[PDB]
Curated annotation (Swiss-Prot):
Any GO MF annotation of the entry: aspartic-type endopeptidase activity
Keyword Protease among record annotations: yes
Protein name: Endothiapepsin
Peptidase A1 domain: residues covered: 17-328
UniProt key word Hydrolase: yes
Gene Ontology annotations of biological process type: proteolysis
Family to which this protein belongs: Belongs to the peptidase A1 family.
Enzyme category, top tier: hydrolase
Catalytic site positions: D35, S199
Disulfide linkage: C255-C290
First and last residues shown, out of full length: 90 to 419 of 419
Keywords from the named record: Aspartyl protease, Disulfide bond, Hydrolase, Protease, Signal, Zymogen
Coiled-coil annotated spans: none
EC number: 3.4.23.22
Length: 330
């Protein structure tokens, strides 16, 4: 089997991407944030504290003939921005782009933190990291991909995120029309539960390539590109007036700037992020200070190849017995 679904930016800055997912019988369609950095499929629901729901579409298990309470199971998760959610668990039928999994753990939120409530466009998350990170207790649950894998034509999914435009998540096949040139594959460590790999270096604008190993994760659920302070300083030094602002929480730059591109290495291959992708607009409405899309990972504990990086590539998440990651230009 295969599946193919369109993923769409939630706003004009590509702050996140949503993908329609069918849950239950008859189908209840929710728009979920596909997140290769976590491993829980959770949704706003009829159980979510009413004051914490503001415009989201909710899953109502009592209206699904295939829903079953997973008795005794609870979940609780927190993300890198300090946001969080928790609740109980149902099993139900879940379909993405025509690919159906029966018996998928659908984690129903009883509570969500403020930044989820305030995001009216995101109805929940669909985790695509390794199932070892799943938070369900006392019986850990499998991701949608893990459950689908054996049925897929090939044990892979691909992320093709757009810049200010829709893109695609495919399951079970590689669309050879969706990228240019060849795909370069690189090794993955699953030791921390992530799609963790080592970039071979970087360049800023038209500058020379610096060969240096940068360990990080391919994370569709993180908006920005978070890299070591040395790398990030070298980038922003090429933008007149750019500075790190403690008050804003990262590098800002004059909105009048033309940002240079940023290149990262994948083996001997190179992915170029255009300068436009690095612009996250005014820090507050009407400001002439703009927020940068490349930020320091210092104090995060890990480097993160988030959407800013991934949307410059066609990315293969190869879930074979020994997982790997592939990147192509597009």
């Amino acid at each position: 089997s295969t599946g193919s679904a369109t993923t769409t930016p939630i706003d004009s800055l590509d702050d996140a991407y949503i993908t329609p997912v069918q849950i239950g019988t008859p189908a209840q369609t929710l728009n979920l944030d596909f997140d290769t950095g976590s491993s829980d499929l959770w949704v706003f629901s009829s159980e979510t504290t009413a004051s914490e729901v503001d415009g989201q579409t909710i899953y109502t298990p009592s209206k699904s003939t295939t829903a079953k309470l997973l008795s005794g199971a609870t979940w609780s998760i927190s993300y890198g921005d300090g946001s969080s959610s928790s609740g109980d668990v149902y099993t139900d039928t879940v379909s993405v782009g025509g690919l159906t999994v029966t018996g998928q753990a659908v984690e129903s939120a009883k509570k969500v933190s403020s930044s989820f409530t305030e995001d009216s466009t995101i109805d929940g998350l669909l985790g695509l990291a390794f199932s070892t990170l799943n938070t369900v207790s006392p019986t850990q649950q499998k991701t949608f991909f893990d459950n689908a894998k054996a049925s897929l034509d090939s044990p892979v999914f691909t992320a093709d995120l757009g810049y200010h435009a829709p893109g695609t998540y495919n399951f079970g096949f590689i669309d050879t029309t969706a990228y240019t040139g060849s795909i370069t594959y690189t090794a993955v460590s699953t030791k921390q539960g992530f799609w963790e790999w080592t970039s071979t270096g970087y360049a800023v604008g038209s500058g020379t390539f610096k060969s240096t190993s940068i360990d990080g994760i391919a994370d569709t659920g993180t908006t920005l590109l978070y890299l070591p302070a040395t790398v990030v300083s070298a980038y922003w030094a090429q933008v007149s007036g750019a500075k790190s602002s403690s008050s804003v929480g990262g590098y800002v730059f004059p909105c009048s700037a033309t940002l240079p591109s940023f290149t990262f290495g994948v083996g001997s291959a190179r992915i170029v992020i255009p300068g436009d992708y690095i612009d996250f607009g005014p820090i507050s409405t009407g400001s002439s200070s703009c927020f940068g899309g490349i930020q320091s990972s210092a104090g995060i504990g890990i480097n993160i190849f988030g959407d800013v990086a991934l949307k410059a590539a066609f990315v293969v998440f190869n879930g074979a017995t020994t997982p790997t990651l592939g990147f192509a230009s597009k």
